Amino acid sequence: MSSLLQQTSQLLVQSYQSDNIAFKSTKQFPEKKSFLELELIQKILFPDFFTRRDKRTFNNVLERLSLLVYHIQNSIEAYYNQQLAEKCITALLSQFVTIRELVKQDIIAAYTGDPAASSLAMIIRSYPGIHVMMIQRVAHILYMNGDIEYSRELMENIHSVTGIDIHPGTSIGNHFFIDHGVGVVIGETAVIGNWCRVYQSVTLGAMSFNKRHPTIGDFVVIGAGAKVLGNITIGSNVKIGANCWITQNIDQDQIVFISEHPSQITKENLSWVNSP
Amino acid sequence: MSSLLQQTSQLLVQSYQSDNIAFKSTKQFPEKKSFLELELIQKILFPDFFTRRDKRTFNNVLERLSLLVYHIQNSIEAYYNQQLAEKCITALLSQFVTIRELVKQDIIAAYTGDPAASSLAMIIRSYPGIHVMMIQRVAHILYMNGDIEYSRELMENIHSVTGIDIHPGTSIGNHFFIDHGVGVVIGETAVIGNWCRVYQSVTLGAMSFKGNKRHPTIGDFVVIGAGAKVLGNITIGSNVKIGANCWITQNIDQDQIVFISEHPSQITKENLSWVNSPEL
Amino acid sequence: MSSLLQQTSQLLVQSYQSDNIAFKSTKQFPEKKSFLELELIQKILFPDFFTRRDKRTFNNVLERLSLLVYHIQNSIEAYYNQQLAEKCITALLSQFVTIRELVKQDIIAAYTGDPAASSLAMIIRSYPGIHVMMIQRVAHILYMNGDIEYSRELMENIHSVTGIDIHPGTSIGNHFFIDHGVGVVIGETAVIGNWCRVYQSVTLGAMSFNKRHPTIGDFVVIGAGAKVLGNITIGSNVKIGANCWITQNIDQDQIVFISEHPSQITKENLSWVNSPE
């Protein structure tokens, strides 16, 4: 409905104005190409960082939001019907400013959680853990309103570009930060709390061989390469060391780490190019 | 060669028609872009999910097939010569329907092996483990007929898009399912049986530190859980399940469940303020 | 500026002439697309493998180099200003043939370090560990001279394409080989010596929960899945086995590996297709 696109675009413009200045910029950053939904959602959520200086008006918001919605409608129709597409888009449109506020808190969590994060522009423009969450919070609305096929395709699109695999059904709290992220897998029935931090190669997955994925409390940190598997619960304030294999419930305020250290035992160019 | 292209085109048309109903669809999906060989192979193997409804005639199949093989022929020539390129292409065309039947079984394996896979359409359009096998089964025929350079480049292309790293020399049986797949690495001389399932971050690789076998051979019905590292010229029997994060460096007999010996150990023990910092 | 671009172009052309037999090629390969900076750096460093035969004159080199330089300059200007952008561009130009020498040594390291590496052509066109180092050696110059935002952006672009995550601040010696590479993460303050070899899913990272990343010596090999965390040192000639969790220093001339083997215990298409349809 044209009326919903227009109402949502004005709500978005209001959201831009009440932004903290940290989320603003007078600069004109270079073009970022990726794929359609991400390019558009980036522009819609944070135009200052992804658009030409002259294309940051209400009409540009309306055009971009309309391109996004029409593409989403055509895809949901291809897998399902017009009736379901409309229901999904309506829900998405009503949720868009809420999504935008959630993505801002993800960005805040990245700046807080990463010593290498120097500014919000760096995080917004280049942190893949942020871009996966821009797409996931949109895809999750679609999934929850009955579209499980396009929402999965959407997540597989961002999966391809970041190496981060999050199912559209995953339920994720606020201030969620994935650092680096390549190899991260989070399954359909997983539940994640607030202020969680997750590193590369972490799996929140099903047992190797209904609810079949982990639930994670608040303020949980999961170190690189940990594999957290099965319908289990990690309590709040848990820290999980790198490469742990975790298949059991873990109580709150715990620290989990591989038990023991490994074993240690002791002990030009022309030549190399002469051999080929 | 045109006569071979026409027969393969006609055999593919016949293959489409004998498909089970589950592989067919009357719908018009949005176009999917990636890179040339993947887009073309997708349209060649499953037109119903990747092409405009008015581009599904024998001639459209022949156009897509011709463009694919002739891009392959031009790349192989660049590394080698026209004779080897023709040889590789001929083998690929003659195996093309065989490849299609194998990919269909990979799709079946994905559907049975994944509680989140709800339809064949979803699997066909979006599962990276299926897309990597579309490429790998093509590349492997090229490699086996002598083109080791372009078949590797081809595999690195699909690597760049899926994060799944499979060598063109890898020998892989039917009904093979990779779930999630990022970080998967499978080496040149590895051999994989039938009905295997492999998860993210799995290596079937060489020992960290000719006709050699330096990568693993795994049997049928093997499941390898996330993060497992299976290294060296070792054999994993059929019906073996390997738990997550395992480090395997020895042969494993059939009918074994393998897992890390010990659980990890375990010991006990806003925006406003945050926004004040980057503002100032 | 125009004259430094011309002298850098002539030094590059001479560097092409100086190459060993093995880095040359009479054949013409199909173009490779990715993203702008990688396409240009590939063509500038190895024209024989990435450009048409008729686009290898001095002016062709000068146009490719200028396109790159002007793209980087505007990108840095966008995050900072003309003053810093020129400082970085000047530094990069003065070091361009040095970077080319280092990348050739990375290629040599890949050939000697990988049995699947059959030829330099294959390595130059297709090895993602080489492509990430083409970018990183450029991005490191930019980072060292004050541009920490665009050099990060650059590294994230090559990250999307390879799944290899190397910070622009990382300091890396010569003959560096990443095999496979997906899931490799190397942090901002890490230091890597010469002739090191790193596999997929390796982290040289900070503690999960100034310098906070590891220093690695010469001839270190780190197997797949190893996590090396914190401001620790791995001495030279160390071999680190797959999936190791390293949180303490390792002296030189050591082999490190998980000490215990895993425990073990014993124990129709048509029908499936009817199920869902």
In order, the DSSP letters of A112-160 are HH-TT---HHHHHHH-HHHHHHHHHHHHHHHHHTT--HHHHHHHHHHHH
Per the CB < 8 Å rule, is A71 touching B27? Answer: no
Among the listed residues B175, B181, B192, the one whose alpha carbon sits nearest the alpha carbon of residue B126: B181
B272 touches A: beta carbon within 8 Å: no
Among the listed residues A43, A49, A54, A16, the one whose alpha carbon sits nearest the alpha carbon of residue A30: A49
Contacts of B278 in chain A (CB under 8 A): 22, 111, 119-120
Cα distance between residue C18 and residue B171, in whole Å: 42
Out of A118, A201, A262, closest to residue C244 by CB: A262
Query: What phi and psi, each to the nearest 5 degrees, are found at residue A189?
Result: -100, 10
Per the CB < 8 Å rule, is A182 touching C182? Answer: yes
Q: What is the number of other CB atoms lying within 10 angstroms of the CB of residue B150?
A: 29
Contacts of B259 in chain C (CB under 8 A): 262-264
Order the strands of the B197-198 sheet from edge to edge: B177-178, B197-198, B223-224, B241-242, B256-259, C263-266
Cα distance between residue B128 and residue B115, in whole Å: 16
Among the listed residues B270, B167, A225, the one whose alpha carbon sits nearest the alpha carbon of residue C229: A225
Distance (Å) from the alpha carbon of C173 to chain B's nearest alpha carbon: 21
A67 touches C: beta carbon within 8 Å: no
Per the CB < 8 Å rule, is B260 touching A246? Answer: no
Per the CB < 8 Å rule, is B165 touching C183? Answer: no
Out of B20, B79, B149, closest to residue C273 by CB: B20
Q: Is B163 within 8 Å of B152 (Cβ atoms)?
A: no
Tokens of B188: 């040149």
Domain region containing B89: 2-166
Compute the Cα dihedral for A261, A267, A270, A276 and give only its sign.
negative
Q: Is C49 within 8 Å of C73 (Cβ atoms)?
A: no
SS3 C277: coil
**Nearest Cα residue in chain A from C184:** A182
Instruction: Mark C96-117 as b/e (b = at least 16 C-beta within 10 Å).
Output: bbebbebbbbbbbbbbebbebb
Cα distance between residue C260 and residue C277, in whole Å: 48
Interacting residues of A187 by C-beta distance below 8 A, sequence separation 6+: A167, A170, A204, A205, A206, A212, A213, B116
Map C229-269 to HEC letters: ECCCEECCCCEECCCCEECCCECCCEEEECCCCCEEEECCH
Chain A interface, best mutation among B26, B178, B274, by max A CB count within 10 A: B274
Q: Is A136 within 8 Å of A97 (Cβ atoms)?
A: no
Tokens of B55: 């581009």
Contacts of A162 in chain B (CB under 8 A): none
SS3 B185: strand
Tokens of C20: 């060993």
Among the listed residues A228, A92, C108, C82, the one whose alpha carbon sits nearest the alpha carbon of residue B263: A228
Maximum alpha-carbon separation in chain B: 74
Q: What is the number of other CB atoms lying within 10 angstroms of the CB of residue C23?
A: 18
Per the CB < 8 Å rule, is C127 touching B156? Answer: yes
Concatenating the DSSP letter of every residue in C108-153 gives: HHHHHH-TT---HHHHHHH-HHHHHHHHHHHHHHHHHTT--SHHHH
Order the strands of the A185-186 sheet from edge to edge: A165-166, A185-186, A203-205, A227-229, A245-246
Length of chain C: 277
Cα distance between residue C6 and residue B278, in whole Å: 41
Task: Please list the alpha-helical segments (H only) found in chain B.
Answer: 2-17, 36-45, 47-50, 58-79, 82-94, 96-113, 120-126, 128-144, 148-162, 271-279
Q: Is residue C221 within a helix (H) or strand (E), and if so which, with residue range?
A: strand C221-222
Instruction: Mark B69-107 as b/e (b = at least 16 C-beta within 10 Å).
Output: beebbebbbbbbeeebbebbbebbbebbeebbebbbbbb
Per the CB < 8 Å rule, is A201 touching B223? Answer: no
Distance (Å) from the alpha carbon of A88 to chain C's nearest alpha carbon: 25
Per the CB < 8 Å rule, is A223 touching C227? Answer: yes
Out of C33, C118, C243, closest to residue B247 by CB: C243
Out of C28, C128, C223, closest to residue B160 by CB: C128
Cα distance between residue C22 and residue C16, in whole Å: 12
Per the CB < 8 Å rule, is A245 touching B245? Answer: yes
Helical pair A82-113 and A2-17, crossing angle rounded to 10 deg: 10
Per the CB < 8 Å rule, is C149 touching A243? Answer: no
Contacts of C128 in chain B (CB under 8 A): 156, 159-160
Tokens of B44: 């060649």
Q: Is B130 within 8 Å of B162 (Cβ atoms)?
A: no
Cα distance between residue A165 and residue B199, in whole Å: 12
Among the listed residues A161, B164, B242, the one whose alpha carbon sits nearest the alpha carbon of residue C201: B164
What radius of gyration do chain B's Cα atoms show? Answer: 21
Chain A interface, best mutation among C108, C111, C152, by max A CB count within 10 A: C152
Residue with tokens 């952006």: C153
CB–CB contacts below 8 A, A to B:
144
Tokens of B213: 């076998």
Paired residues of C265 in beta bridges: B257
Q: Is C103 within 8 Å of C149 (Cβ atoms)?
A: no
B3 touches C: beta carbon within 8 Å: no
Cα distance between residue B186 and residue B218, in whole Å: 11
Q: What secondary structure letter does DSSP report for B224?
A: E
Cα distance between residue C2 and residue C147, in whole Å: 22
Cα distance between residue C115 and residue C134, in whole Å: 22
Q: What are chain C's partners, defined as 3 or more CB pairs within 8 angstroms?
A: A, B
Parallel, antiparallel, or unpaired for β A215-216 and A191-192? Answer: parallel
What radius of gyration do chain C's Cα atoms show? Answer: 21
Cα distance between residue B164 and residue C163, in whole Å: 10
Cα distance between residue B98 and residue B127, in whole Å: 21
Side-chain-side CA neighbours of residue A94 (13 Å): 8
Interacting residues of A199 by C-beta distance below 8 A, sequence separation 6+: A178, A179, A180, A181, A184, A222, A223, A224, A225, A226, A242, C203, C205, C208
Rounded-to-5 percentages of helix, strand, coil across chain A: 45, 15, 40
Out of A182, A212, A245, closest to residue B163 by CB: A182
Q: Is B45 within 8 Å of B103 (Cβ atoms)?
A: yes
A116 touches C: beta carbon within 8 Å: yes
Among the listed residues A189, A250, A259, the one whose alpha carbon sits nearest the alpha carbon of residue A222: A250
**Nearest Cα residue in chain B from C259:** B247
Contacts of B74 in chain C (CB under 8 A): 30
Q: What are chain B's partners, defined as 3 or more CB pairs within 8 angstroms?
A: A, C
Interacting residues of C111 by C-beta distance below 8 A, sequence separation 6+: A272, A276, C117, C119, C120, C123
Maximum alpha-carbon separation in chain A: 74
Q: Is B96 within 8 Å of B119 (Cβ atoms)?
A: no
A112 touches B: beta carbon within 8 Å: yes
Per the CB < 8 Å rule, is C20 touching A243? Answer: no
Q: Is B137 within 8 Å of B156 (Cβ atoms)?
A: no
A residues 125..144 contacting B (CB < 8 A): none
Compute the Cα dihedral for B209, B215, B221, B224 and give only its sign.
positive
Distances (CA, A) of B260 to A250, B212, B227, C120, C243: 18, 30, 12, 40, 12
Which own/partner contact pairs does A257-263 have at CB distance under 8 Å and 24+ positions apart?
A257/B264, A257/B265, A258/B264, A258/B265, A258/C245, A259/B262, A259/B263, A259/B264, A259/B265, A260/C259, A261/C248, A262/C241, A262/C244, A262/C245, A262/C246, A262/C256, A262/C257, A262/C258, A262/C259, A263/C256, A263/C257, A263/C258, A263/C259
Cα distance between residue C111 and residue C119, in whole Å: 7
Distance (Å) from the alpha carbon of A82 to chain B's nearest alpha carbon: 13
* Cα angle C104-C109-C111, degrees, rounded to a multiple of 5: 95
Q: Is residue A229 within a helix (H) or strand (E), and if so which, with residue range?
A: strand A227-229
Compute the Cα dihedral for A54, A57, A61, A66 and give only its sign.
negative
A91 touches B: beta carbon within 8 Å: no
**Burial class, C253, CB count within 10 angstroms (exposed 0-12 / middle 13-18 / buried 19+):** middle
Distances (CA, A) of A238 to A83, A110, B98, C213: 44, 19, 51, 23
Per the CB < 8 Å rule, is A245 touching B265? Answer: no
Maximum alpha-carbon separation in chain C: 74
Cα distance between residue B51 and residue B56, in whole Å: 7
B159 touches A: beta carbon within 8 Å: no
Cα distance between residue B57 and residue B40, in whole Å: 15
Interacting residues of A124 by C-beta distance below 8 A, sequence separation 6+: A46, A49, A107, A130
Out of B35, B229, B258, closest to residue C225 by CB: B229
Cα distance between residue C155 and residue A180, in whole Å: 12
**Burial class, C15, CB count within 10 angstroms (exposed 0-12 / middle 13-18 / buried 19+):** middle
What radius of gyration do chain A's Cα atoms show? Answer: 21
Side-chain-side CA neighbours of residue C48 (13 Å): 18
Chain C interface, best mutation among A39, A177, A254, A263, by max C CB count within 10 A: A263
A36 touches B: beta carbon within 8 Å: no
Contacts of C182 in chain A (CB under 8 A): 163, 182-183
**Nearest Cα residue in chain A from B262:** A259
Interacting residues of A105 by C-beta distance below 8 A, sequence separation 6+: A174, A175, B271
**Nearest Cα residue in chain A from C251:** A266
Cα distance between residue C218 and residue C175, in whole Å: 10
What do you get for the CA distance between the two ends of chain A, in Å? 66
Out of B241, B268, B271, closest to residue A254 by CB: B268
Side-chain-side CA neighbours of residue A73 (13 Å): 16
Cα distance between residue B98 and residue B45, in whole Å: 11
Distance (Å) from the alpha carbon of C136 to chain A's nearest alpha carbon: 16
Contacts of A71 in chain B (CB under 8 A): 30
Cα distance between residue C214 and residue C218, in whole Å: 13
Length of chain B: 280
Per the CB < 8 Å rule, is B161 touching A160? Answer: yes
Concatenating the DSSP letter of every residue in C52-97 gives: -TTS-SHHHHHHHHHHHHHHHHHHHHHHS-HHHHHHHHHHHHHTHH
Q: Is B222 left (phi over 0), alpha (psi -120 to 50) or beta?
A: beta
Per the CB < 8 Å rule, is A29 touching C78? Answer: yes
**Burial class, A209, CB count within 10 angstroms (exposed 0-12 / middle 13-18 / buried 19+):** exposed
Distances (CA, A) of B30 to A43, B52, B128, B261: 22, 9, 18, 48
Cα distance between residue B103 and residue B106, in whole Å: 5
Contacts of A229 in chain B (CB under 8 A): 225-226, 244
Q: What secondary structure letter does DSSP report for B191?
A: E
Cα distance between residue C162 and residue C159, in whole Å: 5
Cα distance between residue A107 and residue A232, in whole Å: 28
Instruction: Residue C113: give its domain's CATH number.
Output: 1.10.3130.10
Cα distance between residue C196 and residue C214, in whole Å: 14
B1 touches A: beta carbon within 8 Å: no
Q: Is B156 within 8 Å of B176 (Cβ atoms)?
A: no
Cα distance between residue C260 and residue B260, in whole Å: 9
Helical pair C36-45 and C128-144, crossing angle rounded to 10 deg: 100
Per the CB < 8 Å rule, is C115 touching B259? Answer: no
Query: What phi and psi, each to the nearest 5 degrees, are found at residue A261?
Result: -65, 165
Tokens of C192: 């890597």
SS3 B107: helix
Q: After which residues is chain B broken (C to N over 2.5 A)?
A: 209, 269
Cα distance between residue B2 and residue B6, in whole Å: 6
C residues 208..267 contacting A (CB < 8 A): 208-209, 212, 225, 227, 229, 241, 243-246, 248, 250, 253-259
